[PDB]
Every structure is written in structure tokens, then in C-alpha cells.
């Protein structure tokens, strides 16, 4: 009987391979599975610069691991080619690779610093800033809410919008100038990410002495 080659019995060579993007560098992703008719000792392998750069295959077992992260933001499918070997002759097979989407990104906002002048005498009710952040993961990790932090007796913010509105009377006699903290967090439901920025409220001394 003359050599046959190896082939793969992987499912995922007619389909697809899903990979986390959480998933850790040094860890394994998956098993190259070959069967050789002859018998044959089999060496594995992975065919490709790109994919050599984030796969290496444990020659002897086929096992699959990650050389660096996957990152869902930058690169979310690829293609590369594994291989198997039984000492005479080689095959190469491409794999669909999708990287899958976890919320590992906080909000960012945007146009910071954050500032604004108001008179003393702003009335309640009156819309005075508008902040904005955004999130790049998918669904609900990259929907974003606002609040101020701890709540403010005298600012609101929409959680949808961001957009700032007075509360109570303002008094340049007490207080000549605020610095809020708005928090924006994503809405996931496993892992929510939050982050912090500044809003200074400068005001504007008014005459009005009772
Ligand atoms: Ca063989
Ligand atoms: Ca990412
Ligand atoms: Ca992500
Ligand atoms: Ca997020
Ligand atoms: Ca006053
Ligand atoms: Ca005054």
C-alpha cells in the first residue's frame, strides 16, 4: 500500500472557528484533529505570515494557541490555513476565523476638558452643557448612560442625552463654582464598564443684593 495523506476531522474546516477576543494569550484555542490511514507519526502546523503571527500549533499534538490577543475592535474575521503532515507529504486547509465581541472597552468622552459659565441667576429648568461619550463593543457594552456622581442637588443630567440642566437656585454667595463628576457607564449585563470625567461650572457673580 503506497502513502496516503493525512486529512483533518474538524468540524470547523467546513464552517467556521469562533474565538473569544478575551481569550488569553499563552491559552489554548482549539485541537488539529488528522487521521493517517498508514498509521503515520504527524507533524502540525499553521501555513501563512498573519496567521503565524497570532496562532502557534504544538507540532506533535496539533494543539492550538494564542501568540497575541485578539482584538474583536481592530480585526473581527480572518481566514489562515492549518496543516498536516505525515513525514512524505503535507495538506493545507484555510479555517474562517471570527473573533468574538466581549465589553472590555470603558466609554470615551469627547471635547474634554469640560467647561461652562453661567450667570448666578440661571433660571431652573435652563439646559447649560452637553456631554458626550461613546463605546466601541458591541450591543448592550456599548450603549452608554450618564449620571452625576453622587447625585447633584443642583444638576440634572439625561442618562440618554448628557445633556445638563439646573436644578435649584444657584448663589454665588455660597458657591462660585461647581466641579461635577459624570460618570458614564456601558449598560452590559455580565460586566458594565464605567468612566469618570470633570465638569467645571464657573458662575457668574450677579447684582443682586436683596
Ligand atoms: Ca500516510
Ligand atoms: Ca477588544
Ligand atoms: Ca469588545
Ligand atoms: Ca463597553
Ligand atoms: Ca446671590
Ligand atoms: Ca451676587
Known amino acids: 500500500q503506497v502513502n496516503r495523506l493525512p486529512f483533518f476531522t474538524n468540524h470547523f474546516f467546513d464552517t467556521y472557528l469562533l474565538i473569544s477576543e478575551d481569550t488569553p494569550v499563552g491559552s489554548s484555542v482549539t485541537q488539529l484533529l488528522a487521521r493517517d490511514m498508514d498509521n503515520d507519526p504527524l507533524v502540525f502546523g499553521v501555513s501563512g505570515e498573519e496567521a503565524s503571527r497570532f496562532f502557534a500549533v504544538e507540532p506533535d499534538t496539533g ?4 501568540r497575541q490577543p485578539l482584538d474583536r475592535e481592530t480585526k473581527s474575521e480572518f481566514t489562515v490555513e492549518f496543516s498536516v503532515s505525515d513525514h512524505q507529504g503535507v495538506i493545507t ?35 447649560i452643557f452637553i456631554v458626550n461619550a461613546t463605546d466601541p463593543d458591541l450591543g448592550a457594552g456599548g450603549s452608554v448612560l450618564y449620571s452625576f456622581q453622587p447625585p447633584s442637588p443642583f444638576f440634572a443630567i439625561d442618562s440618554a442625552r448628557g445633556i445638563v440642566t439646573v436644578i435649584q437656585e444657584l448663589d454665588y454667595e455660597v458657591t462660585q463654582a461647581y466641579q461635577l463628576t459624570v460618570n458614564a ?13 470633570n465638569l467645571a461650572i464657573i458662575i457668574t457673580d450677579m447684582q443682586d443684593m436683596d
Open 63 to 66: 494543539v492550538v494557541w494564542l
Open 93 to 127: 486547509r484555510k479555517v474562517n476565523i471570527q473573533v468574538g465581541d466581549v465589553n472590555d472597552n470603558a466609554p470615551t468622552f469627547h471635547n474634554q476638558p469640560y467647561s461652562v459659565r453661567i450667570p448666578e441667576n440661571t433660571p431652573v429648568g435652563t439646559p
Open 185 to 197: 457607564t456601558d449598560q452590559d449585563k455580565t460586566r458594565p464598564l464605567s468612566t469618570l470625567a
